[PDB]
Paper text:
Ras suppressor-1 (Rsu-1) is a leucine-rich repeat (LRR)-containing protein that is crucial for regulating cell adhesion and is involved in such physiological and pathological processes as focal adhesion assembly and tumor metastasis. Rsu-1 interacts with zinc-finger type multi-LIM domain-containing adaptor protein PINCH-1, known to be involved in the integrin-mediated consensus adhesome, but not with its highly homologous family member PINCH-2. Rsu-1 does not have catalytic activity but its primary sequence analysis indicates a leucine-rich repeat (LRR)-containing protein that implicates for protein-binding functions. We also showed that Rsu-1 can be assembled, via PINCH-1-binding, into a heteropentamer complex comprising Rsu-1, PINCH-1, ILK, Parvin, and Kindlin-2, which constitute a major consensus integrin adhesome crucial for focal adhesion assembly.
To gain structural insight into the architecture of Rsu-1, we first crystallized and solved its crystal structure by a single-wavelength anomalous dispersion (SAD) method using a single selenomethionine (SeMet)-substituted crystal. The structure of Rsu-1 was refined at 1.76-Å resolution to an Rwork of 17.3% and an Rfree of 21.7% with good stereochemistry. The structural analysis revealed that Rsu-1 adopts an arc-shaped solenoid architecture with the canonical LRR domain that comprises the N-terminal cap region followed by eight tandem LRRs and the C-terminal cap region with approximate dimensions of 80 Å × 40 Å × 30 Å. The N-terminal cap region consists of one α-helix (residues from 5 to 15) and a loop, whereas the C-terminal cap region of Rsu-1 comprises the ninth β-strand followed by a helix-turn-helix motif. Amphipathic structural features in those N- and C-terminal cap regions shield the hydrophobic core residues in the first and last (eighth) LRRs to stabilize the structural integrity of the LRR domain, respectively. The terminal helix (residues 240–251) in the C-terminal cap region then folds toward the convex surface of the LRR region. A parallel β-sheet with nine β-strands from eight LRR motifs and the following segment composes a characteristic concave surface in the LRR domain of Rsu-1. The structure of Rsu-1 superimposes with that of SDS22 with an RMSD of 1.49 Å for the 195 equivalent Cα atom pairs. Although Rsu-1 comprises two distinct variable sequence lengths (23- and 25-residues) in the LRRs that resemble in part those in the plant-specific (PS) subfamily in the LRR superfamily, our structural analysis strongly suggests that Rsu-1 falls into the SDS22-like subfamily rather than the PS subfamily.
Numbering used by the authors: 2 to 251
Amino acid sequence: SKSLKKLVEESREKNQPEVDMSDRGISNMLDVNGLFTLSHITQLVLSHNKLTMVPPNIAELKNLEVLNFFNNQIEELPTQISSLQKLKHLNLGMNRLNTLPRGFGSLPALEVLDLTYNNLSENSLPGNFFYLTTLRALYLSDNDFEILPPDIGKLTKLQILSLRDNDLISLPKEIGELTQLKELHIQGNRLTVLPPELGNLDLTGQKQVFKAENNPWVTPIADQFQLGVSHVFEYIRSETYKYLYGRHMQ
């Protein structure tokens, strides 16, 4: 409805904290006159546009807590993105990211990271990625991960972890350290066994979610999935499963 000029000018003159520029055909953030003068705004929505980059100028939006780039064509993020010290919610879903910039893990307030439908893999993650220990929800579904790095175990505030439809061949035993987890999505990968340490998690309730269908599970595990998720968790806690799991690797 409103022009981009009016959105910027009204945000500034009335000290308004949220700016909605979703679905406006924007191909370059530098084209939006005055956008980077809004050092006070807390929410910027640029979903459903045609961005292919995010300029380093993003660092001038120092008050941002919510940044939504869902469904653009973004191919890389500037390293300056990690200077957003108030950023709590970052939605980069449905873009074309193959890497995250060095220092990305330096974001001190990040709670929700949506990276669904990109082209990320374990090699995409910078060295300091798992210093993001404020994270409570990490959405990585429909990416290209083949393994999950063991430092995932550092993210002990995580309540939601989505790894749906990646290419995972294993889960690290360090997943067992995520004792606040309520939702784990691992359906649609290439998983054959589960680390016994996943049995440390209670994902059996109506309140918890464990989605794990559509994996090439070994026969004993597949048999337990037929009986129900609680049966899977009991099985992988057993000493006999620990025995066979150790032998199956070798």
